[PDB]
Amino acid sequence: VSGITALTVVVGTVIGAGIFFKPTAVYGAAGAPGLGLLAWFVAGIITIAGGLTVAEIGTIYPQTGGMMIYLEKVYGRWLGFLVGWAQMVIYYPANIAALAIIFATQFVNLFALSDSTIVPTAILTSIFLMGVNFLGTKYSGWIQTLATILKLIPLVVIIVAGLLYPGGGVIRLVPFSVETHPVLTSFGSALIATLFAYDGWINVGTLAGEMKNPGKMLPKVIIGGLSIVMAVYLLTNIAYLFVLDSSQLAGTDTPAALVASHLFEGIGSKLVTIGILISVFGGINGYIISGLRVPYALATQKMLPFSDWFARINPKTNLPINGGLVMLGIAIVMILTGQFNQLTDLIVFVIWFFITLTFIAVIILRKTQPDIERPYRVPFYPVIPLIAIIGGLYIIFNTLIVQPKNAFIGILLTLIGIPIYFYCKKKYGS
């Protein structure tokens, strides 16, 4: 009983709004149905590997923080801090920003409206969700349970219908690698786009830490759950490629929306695209929930310059709203400057820079402190953490060399925190 319940959490937290929007960048970079469809498989394998390795350090440090504390505990207060600065300035705000744009993009697509009203709607949705979160967890949690229930209905309904489309079969995935989109250069632009749909697997640390006596069955739940997601993501892509194809999917910034309007001609496609807008909305809301945590955890130490104001938790709601206000504004900077794929690629390149440090950290720990209590230990010890790091190195090396400008905004904004760190370690906040 216990296991199945957790399993749900894995499936739940991983499944996002990615499948509904990312195929555009996936097949847009791959230029062939078969290359794209493998990027969805490799990303899933990369994250099962990443998941099982991170659960070890998650169990060595049972706490709801993670990477801020996984990395402080092996690399030092400085690396522990950087991840927070990165999460507060880049990762949470751009996730809010990207999904707010894609939400509004899909809003404009469904209610046929101007392609200028993307950005005003992206501001207002992010402004509205920050407000609703400052009201409390009454309304945020109301959105979340509604989002988690309804986000699975469009998928089942797309898989059944898509896999039964009349112009449908293996032939609908036949170009595997097209020479117009070279294999190795394009696969890295595709994997960085499939990974954003697997976003949220990172919280396996906080999950493993949270289990008492995990061991037998904690790895079953990480493998079983993420491979359910992986299977679901491969199935919906075959369904997409049955209706549309490589060049066609890249042709709209809303790929799943088009597939819906083919599979069900009428109001049926509306109920499916509504379901998609709920999936994206619930994303933004759920990112804010998790977002507020970081600037406050920084403010809990010296880490931020206005630590007094950042750490203020309002006695009516029990939340640090002030942290999220800085995050809201820098998301607005990002909604007005980048586009949805520019932002998804930031997020992957940046967080995967730190995610990798955490994998190496498990191996480091095995020699630093082999006698520390390990409630759970990574199975097939050297192999799988090394897999995670092999592909982890691949993504960071490729996005640098593919997107020099987008990688530099991640390198730049992370290192802007180094002057911030030595100011606030001497002055302690304000």
Place this chain on the structure above:
Amino acid sequence: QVQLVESGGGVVQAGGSLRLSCAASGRTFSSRAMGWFRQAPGEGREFVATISWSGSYTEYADSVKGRVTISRDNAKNTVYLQMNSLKPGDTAVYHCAAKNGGAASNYPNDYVYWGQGTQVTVSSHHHHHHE
């Protein structure tokens, strides 16, 4: 289902010491992580310390690290907070809090069960207590 009572607060001298303890309803205590939070008269909640179910992981805030220590006796279903070399800026109602799951937390909203709190007053000279 998880009732909490704090003990050990009171008037102390600056530089003095104080052991807060928080008894819990038992049943689930050993499978739950605990926290110490404090509330100054002019403010909301402030994170002090937290602890894993087992006690393997502990975490203290910047303003109290080194001076304070959090511990638990899962047999006695109690969590302790040993404060030393106190300062007049520790003066607050120290609440004790329980959450679901064995992972520690600095985030107050994680915690579902909260104690009524125990008053701690730190001072170099104080006025009150008549006949």
